Amino acid sequence: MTRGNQRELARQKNMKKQSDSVKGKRRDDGLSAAARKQRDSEIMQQKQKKANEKKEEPK
Numbered sequence: 428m429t430r431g432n433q434r435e436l437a438r439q440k441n442m443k444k445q446s447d448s449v450k451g452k453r454r455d456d457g458l459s460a461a462a463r464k465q466r467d468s469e470i471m472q473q474k475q476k477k478a479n480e481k482k483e484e485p486k
Contacts, residue, residue, distance in 0.1 A: 458466075471478070 455463075
């Protein structure tokens with residue numbers, strides 16, 4: 428917006444609201460836990476990639 432207000436000094440309080448309404452957090456045709464496990468084991472072992480964890484929120 429023309430001559431839009433832009434202040435460096437910004438502050439955010441504890442703002443966390445319910446966003447769990449997404450029930451479509453699974454997408455496959457009909458893989459059994461066996462088939463999934465095997466294919467996961469194939470790509471991960473063949474790649475030999477370390478599935479590293481993102482850092483937690485610290486103090």
